[PDB]
Design a protein around this motif. Sequence first.
Motif, PDB file in Angstrom:
ATOM      1  N   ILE A  97      -1.962   2.852   5.725  1.00  0.00           N
ATOM      2  CA  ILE A  97      -2.390   1.460   6.022  1.00  0.00           C
ATOM      3  C   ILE A  97      -1.636   0.575   5.028  1.00  0.00           C
ATOM      4  CG2 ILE A  97      -4.317  -0.166   5.937  1.00  0.00           C
ATOM      5  CD1 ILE A  97      -6.148   2.114   6.775  1.00  0.00           C
ATOM      6  N   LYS A  98      -1.643   0.877   3.733  1.00  0.00           N
ATOM      7  CA  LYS A  98      -1.010   0.035   2.751  1.00  0.00           C
ATOM      8  C   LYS A  98       0.496  -0.132   3.006  1.00  0.00           C
ATOM      9  CE  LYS A  98      -2.769   0.171  -1.289  1.00  0.00           C
ATOM     10  NZ  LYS A  98      -3.267   0.337  -2.648  1.00  0.00           N
ATOM     11  N   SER A  99       1.172   0.975   3.290  1.00  0.00           N
ATOM     12  CA  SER A  99       2.596   0.967   3.627  1.00  0.00           C
ATOM     13  C   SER A  99       2.875   0.027   4.818  1.00  0.00           C
ATOM     14  CB  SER A  99       3.059   2.349   3.911  1.00  0.00           C
ATOM     15  OG  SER A  99       4.430   2.316   4.330  1.00  0.00           O
ATOM     16  N   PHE A 186      -5.253  -5.669   9.648  1.00  0.00           N
ATOM     17  CA  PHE A 186      -5.577  -4.902   8.436  1.00  0.00           C
ATOM     18  C   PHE A 186      -7.012  -4.418   8.502  1.00  0.00           C
ATOM     19  CE2 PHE A 186      -5.979  -5.904   3.534  1.00  0.00           C
ATOM     20  CZ  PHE A 186      -6.017  -4.569   3.208  1.00  0.00           C
ATOM     21  N   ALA A 187      -7.950  -5.321   8.776  1.00  0.00           N
ATOM     22  CA  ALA A 187      -9.365  -4.950   8.798  1.00  0.00           C
ATOM     23  C   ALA A 187      -9.594  -3.858   9.844  1.00  0.00           C
ATOM     24  CB  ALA A 187     -10.175  -6.179   9.105  1.00  0.00           C
ATOM     25  N   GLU A 188      -8.973  -3.974  11.023  1.00  0.00           N
ATOM     26  CA  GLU A 188      -9.152  -3.014  12.098  1.00  0.00           C
ATOM     27  C   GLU A 188      -8.588  -1.620  11.715  1.00  0.00           C
ATOM     28  OE1 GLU A 188      -7.878  -4.655  15.841  1.00  0.00           O
ATOM     29  OE2 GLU A 188      -8.052  -2.710  16.853  1.00  0.00           O
ATOM     30  N   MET A 189      -7.471  -1.591  11.003  1.00  0.00           N
ATOM     31  CA  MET A 189      -6.958  -0.289  10.539  1.00  0.00           C
ATOM     32  C   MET A 189      -7.962   0.380   9.606  1.00  0.00           C
ATOM     33  SD  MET A 189      -2.807  -0.554   9.891  1.00  0.00           S
ATOM     34  CE  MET A 189      -2.732  -2.093   9.066  1.00  0.00           C
ATOM     35  N   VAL A 190      -8.563  -0.401   8.699  1.00  0.00           N
ATOM     36  CA  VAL A 190      -9.478   0.152   7.712  1.00  0.00           C
ATOM     37  C   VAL A 190     -10.768   0.622   8.375  1.00  0.00           C
ATOM     38  CG1 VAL A 190     -10.953  -0.517   5.757  1.00  0.00           C
ATOM     39  CG2 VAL A 190      -8.541  -1.245   5.842  1.00  0.00           C
ATOM     40  N   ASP A 249     -11.213  -1.174  -1.103  1.00  0.00           N
ATOM     41  CA  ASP A 249     -11.413  -1.420  -2.524  1.00  0.00           C
ATOM     42  C   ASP A 249     -11.315  -2.930  -2.832  1.00  0.00           C
ATOM     43  OD1 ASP A 249      -8.665  -2.193  -3.300  1.00  0.00           O
ATOM     44  OD2 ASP A 249      -8.089  -0.151  -3.424  1.00  0.00           O
ATOM     45  N   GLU A 250     -11.645  -3.263  -4.067  1.00  0.00           N
ATOM     46  CA  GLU A 250     -11.753  -4.675  -4.475  1.00  0.00           C
ATOM     47  C   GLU A 250     -10.408  -5.395  -4.334  1.00  0.00           C
ATOM     48  OE1 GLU A 250     -15.061  -5.051  -5.876  1.00  0.00           O
ATOM     49  OE2 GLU A 250     -14.627  -7.165  -5.381  1.00  0.00           O
ATOM     50  N   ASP A 251      -9.303  -4.728  -4.611  1.00  0.00           N
ATOM     51  CA  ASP A 251      -7.993  -5.375  -4.415  1.00  0.00           C
ATOM     52  C   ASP A 251      -7.755  -5.695  -2.937  1.00  0.00           C
ATOM     53  OD1 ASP A 251      -6.924  -5.357  -7.138  1.00  0.00           O
ATOM     54  OD2 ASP A 251      -6.291  -3.338  -6.900  1.00  0.00           O
ATOM     55  N   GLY A 252      -7.997  -4.733  -2.086  1.00  0.00           N
ATOM     56  CA  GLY A 252      -7.824  -4.948  -0.648  1.00  0.00           C
ATOM     57  C   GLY A 252      -8.731  -6.031  -0.112  1.00  0.00           C
ATOM     58  N   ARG A 253      -9.986  -6.046  -0.539  1.00  0.00           N
ATOM     59  CA  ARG A 253     -10.922  -7.062  -0.051  1.00  0.00           C
ATOM     60  C   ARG A 253     -10.499  -8.436  -0.540  1.00  0.00           C
ATOM     61  NH1 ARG A 253     -14.634  -3.597  -2.225  1.00  0.00           N
ATOM     62  NH2 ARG A 253     -15.846  -5.246  -3.178  1.00  0.00           N
ATOM     63  N   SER A 254     -10.006  -8.530  -1.772  1.00  0.00           N
ATOM     64  CA  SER A 254      -9.515  -9.812  -2.294  1.00  0.00           C
ATOM     65  C   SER A 254      -8.345 -10.303  -1.430  1.00  0.00           C
ATOM     66  CB  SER A 254      -9.144  -9.667  -3.741  1.00  0.00           C
ATOM     67  OG  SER A 254      -8.734 -10.900  -4.294  1.00  0.00           O
ATOM     68  N   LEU A 255      -7.383  -9.435  -1.181  1.00  0.00           N
ATOM     69  CA  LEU A 255      -6.227  -9.823  -0.348  1.00  0.00           C
ATOM     70  C   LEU A 255      -6.717 -10.214   1.038  1.00  0.00           C
ATOM     71  CD1 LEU A 255      -3.282 -10.105   0.361  1.00  0.00           C
ATOM     72  CD2 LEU A 255      -3.212  -7.686   0.751  1.00  0.00           C
ATOM     73  N   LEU A 256      -7.576  -9.455   1.666  1.00  0.00           N
ATOM     74  CA  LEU A 256      -8.051  -9.768   3.019  1.00  0.00           C
ATOM     75  C   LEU A 256      -8.714 -11.157   3.017  1.00  0.00           C
ATOM     76  CD1 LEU A 256      -8.412  -8.984   5.967  1.00  0.00           C
ATOM     77  CD2 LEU A 256     -10.567  -7.923   5.307  1.00  0.00           C
ATOM     78  N   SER A 257      -9.550 -11.432   2.016  1.00  0.00           N
ATOM     79  CA  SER A 257     -10.240 -12.739   1.957  1.00  0.00           C
ATOM     80  C   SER A 257      -9.214 -13.867   1.920  1.00  0.00           C
ATOM     81  CB  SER A 257     -11.136 -12.813   0.773  1.00  0.00           C
ATOM     82  OG  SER A 257     -11.723 -14.102   0.728  1.00  0.00           O
ATOM     83  N   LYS A 271       4.920 -14.104   1.375  1.00  0.00           N
ATOM     84  CA  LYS A 271       5.627 -13.821   0.136  1.00  0.00           C
ATOM     85  C   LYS A 271       4.636 -13.603  -0.990  1.00  0.00           C
ATOM     86  CE  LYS A 271       9.147 -16.507  -2.191  1.00  0.00           C
ATOM     87  NZ  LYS A 271      10.392 -17.280  -1.950  1.00  0.00           N
ATOM     88  N   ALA A 272       3.615 -14.453  -1.113  1.00  0.00           N
ATOM     89  CA  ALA A 272       2.617 -14.252  -2.206  1.00  0.00           C
ATOM     90  C   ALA A 272       1.798 -12.982  -1.999  1.00  0.00           C
ATOM     91  CB  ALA A 272       1.696 -15.425  -2.327  1.00  0.00           C
ATOM     92  N   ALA A 273       1.546 -12.651  -0.739  1.00  0.00           N
ATOM     93  CA  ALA A 273       0.807 -11.414  -0.475  1.00  0.00           C
ATOM     94  C   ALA A 273       1.597 -10.171  -0.979  1.00  0.00           C
ATOM     95  CB  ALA A 273       0.471 -11.342   0.976  1.00  0.00           C
ATOM     96  N   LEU A 274       2.930 -10.179  -0.856  1.00  0.00           N
ATOM     97  CA  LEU A 274       3.710  -9.023  -1.321  1.00  0.00           C
ATOM     98  C   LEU A 274       3.497  -8.776  -2.809  1.00  0.00           C
ATOM     99  CD1 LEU A 274       6.896  -9.620   0.835  1.00  0.00           C
ATOM    100  CD2 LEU A 274       5.314  -7.736   1.026  1.00  0.00           C
ATOM    101  N   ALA A 275       3.209  -9.811  -3.587  1.00  0.00           N
ATOM    102  CA  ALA A 275       3.008  -9.722  -5.042  1.00  0.00           C
ATOM    103  C   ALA A 275       1.563  -9.383  -5.399  1.00  0.00           C
ATOM    104  CB  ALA A 275       3.424 -11.051  -5.641  1.00  0.00           C
ATOM    105  N   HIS A 276       0.699  -9.196  -4.433  1.00  0.00           N
ATOM    106  CA  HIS A 276      -0.727  -8.940  -4.697  1.00  0.00           C
ATOM    107  C   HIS A 276      -0.900  -7.584  -5.375  1.00  0.00           C
ATOM    108  CE1 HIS A 276      -5.022  -8.408  -4.097  1.00  0.00           C
ATOM    109  NE2 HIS A 276      -5.088  -9.726  -3.938  1.00  0.00           N
TER     110      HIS A 276
END
Length: 291
Positions: A97-99, A186-190, A249-257, A271-276
């Motif tokens: 999913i992350k890849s 993303f949410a649907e994959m998870v 996890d908390e990183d993924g939920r932060s990015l999704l939000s 572009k900013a998401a790639l640096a998350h």
Amino acid sequence: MENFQKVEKIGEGTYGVVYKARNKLTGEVVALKKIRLPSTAIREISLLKELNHPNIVKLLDVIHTENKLYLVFEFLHQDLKKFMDASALTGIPLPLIKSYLFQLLQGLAFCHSHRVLHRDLKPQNLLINTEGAIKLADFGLARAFGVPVRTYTHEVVTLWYRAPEILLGCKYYSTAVDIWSLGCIFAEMVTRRALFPGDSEIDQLFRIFRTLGTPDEVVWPGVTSMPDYKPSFPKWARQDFSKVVPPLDEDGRSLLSQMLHYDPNKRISAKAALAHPFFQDVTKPVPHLRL
């Protein structure tokens, strides 16, 4: 048939039949998309032959002959919709999913940097290969033909990935609409379940409202002046993302939000998401594909 051999009907697409075919000159296997019915569309779509990136399905030719339009694409053997359906009992592994999210963001960042939007991202137009790549199909088109209510064979075009500004009748689109769609994917994959599986515009909108809260001027300045906004919309409270997408996890939920902020201006860029920090440990695994 003058220029290629039409192996099979791949499927029935939003705009016309999709064929697997062989180029008669080169022998290459390609996806051929017939577009059923305009000069403005031809120049626009032709410009996409230069919008080349490893995470964008290659547009090989725009063939306008016999007063018909065919798009010739790189062929990929699987789409994410079918892959997610085949993965239902186990889920897609988190590293994969992350890849996939990382690669999709790279494709978005590239197109957005060239001022090209998709506007109709969905699992069916995310294509995957045996090497662990995922690529976006049909970029820039939504700007050429529109997005119909029904396909040429009367299939309903899905609303599930449509951004709230579109549903509220904004006649102008920004790059943020594609971030919203990708967050839904993303949410649907998870979770193994569509996030907002609406079956009408109001059902779509109200599903968003029941999870994220009914938007207001605090979180979305300007929303109450949107064409299709009504002051009578029910007032739902916002749900914690811990309840919506466990076990992310908390990183993924932060990015999704950040991908699902109501105000398109607040939504994270590709572009900013790639640096998350969610991508600090990203890898490129090999998926289990049966063809």
